[PDB]
Design an enzyme around this catalytic site. Structure first.
Site, PDB file in Angstrom:
ATOM      1  N   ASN B  84     -87.569 -54.902 133.336  1.00 50.31           N
ATOM      2  CA  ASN B  84     -88.147 -53.612 133.715  1.00 50.31           C
ATOM      3  C   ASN B  84     -89.613 -53.662 134.081  1.00 50.31           C
ATOM      4  OD1 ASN B  84     -86.159 -52.823 131.055  1.00 50.31           O
ATOM      5  ND2 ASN B  84     -85.684 -51.980 133.090  1.00 50.31           N
ATOM      6  N   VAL B  91     -95.044 -51.186 134.769  1.00 50.74           N
ATOM      7  CA  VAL B  91     -93.999 -51.018 133.774  1.00 50.74           C
ATOM      8  C   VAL B  91     -93.113 -49.831 134.141  1.00 50.74           C
ATOM      9  CG1 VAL B  91     -93.442 -50.631 131.345  1.00 50.74           C
ATOM     10  CG2 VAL B  91     -95.485 -51.926 131.966  1.00 50.74           C
ATOM     11  N   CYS B  92     -91.806 -50.078 134.152  1.00 51.05           N
ATOM     12  CA  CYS B  92     -90.801 -49.060 134.425  1.00 51.05           C
ATOM     13  C   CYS B  92     -90.222 -48.502 133.114  1.00 51.05           C
ATOM     14  CB  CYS B  92     -89.686 -49.643 135.318  1.00 51.05           C
ATOM     15  SG  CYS B  92     -88.378 -48.465 135.794  1.00 51.05           S
ATOM     16  N   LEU B  93     -90.643 -47.295 132.759  1.00 49.85           N
ATOM     17  CA  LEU B  93     -90.261 -46.695 131.485  1.00 49.85           C
ATOM     18  C   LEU B  93     -90.190 -45.177 131.645  1.00 49.85           C
ATOM     19  CD1 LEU B  93     -89.624 -47.199 128.422  1.00 49.85           C
ATOM     20  CD2 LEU B  93     -92.079 -46.878 128.025  1.00 49.85           C
ATOM     21  N   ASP B 126     -82.397 -49.467 134.815  1.00 41.95           N
ATOM     22  CA  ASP B 126     -83.622 -49.325 135.620  1.00 41.95           C
ATOM     23  C   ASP B 126     -84.398 -50.618 135.869  1.00 41.95           C
ATOM     24  OD1 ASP B 126     -83.349 -46.241 134.878  1.00 41.95           O
ATOM     25  OD2 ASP B 126     -84.922 -46.419 136.403  1.00 41.95           O
TER      26      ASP B 126
END
Lengths: 101, 157
Positions: B84, B91-93, B126
């Site tokens: 991610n 950062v993908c969150l 994701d």
């Protein structure tokens, strides 16, 4: 939120003089953080060692501080915030570094 | 802007009074040696008992003028091997996305804990990079070895 106005020579006063003689001594802050109100979150003085010491010898004007600038001082060890308005003055005389209006 | 900065002062003070062990979050230095409240350099320790253990992972956090209505942008520097994390480091969150799980009450502490948590629970729905996602999905023992190797590399010493 209390407010004060200080007269001084922006080209002669150091960051360290502002920290120690003005904010700590005159205004009785114990561990101040001082921010320039430029809308960019500029922190001029930090109460953390050793984050802003490298600027202690520098004149206030080196950071864009001029006639009408506003600083916000915030004590880390008290609930105590203070807005400081700067009046640039070149006529305080030889025995005076700053004056509280 | 003033709303954002007032909040960021509160965040900084609460962090200084109490942060979790091994974590780091401090406003970054502008080129003139002032500090910038809207741009923090941070560090995240790998969680104990996991293959991230022993690693210290540095990242930058950028706040916009409409914070805390918007979340900060977070980016690992350097970029990490993790499903991610984008090649750029971003950062993908979901708590970091304004249209999803971001709420203004979320603290910097909560962001850094949420990112630390993400490290050992990749979100497979994701993915943000090809390599770590592919290996995580196809070869979980090889995935664990790459993470261990990476944690060894970012060991502070």
């Amino acid at each position: 939120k209390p407010e004060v106005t200080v007269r001084l020579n922006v080209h002669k006063v150091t960051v360290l003089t502002l920290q120690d003689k003005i904010v700590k001594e005159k205004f009785a802050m114990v561990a101040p953080d001082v921010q320039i109100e430029d809308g960019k979150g500029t922190i001029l003085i930090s109460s953390e060692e050793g984050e802003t010491e490298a600027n202690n010898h520098k004149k206030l004007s080196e950071f864009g501080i001029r006639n009408g600038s506003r600083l916000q001082a915030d004590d880390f060890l008290q609930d105590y915030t203070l807005l400081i308005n700067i009046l640039h003055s070149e006529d305080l005389g030889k025995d005076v570094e700053f004056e509280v209006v | 802007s003033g709303i954002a900065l007032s909040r960021l002062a509160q965040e900084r003070k609460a962090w200084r009074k109490d942060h979790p062990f091994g974590f780091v979050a401090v406003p970054t230095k502008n080129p003139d040696g002032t500090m910038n409240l809207m741009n923090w350099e941070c560090a995240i320790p790998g969680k104990k008992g996991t293959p991230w253990e022993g690693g210290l992972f540095k990242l930058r956090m950028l706040f916009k003028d409409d914070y805390p209505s918007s979340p900060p942008k977070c980016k690992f520097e350097p970029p990490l091997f993790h499903p991610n994390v984008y090649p750029s480091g971003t950062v993908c969150l979901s708590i970091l996305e304004e249209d999803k799980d971001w709420r203004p009450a979320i603290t910097i502490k909560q962001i850094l804990l949420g990112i630390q948590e993400l490290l050992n629970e990749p979100n497979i729905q994701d993915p943000a990079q090809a390599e770590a996602y592919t290996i995580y999905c196809q070869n979980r023992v090889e995935y664990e070895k790459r993470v261990r190797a990476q944690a060894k590399k970012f060991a502070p010493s």
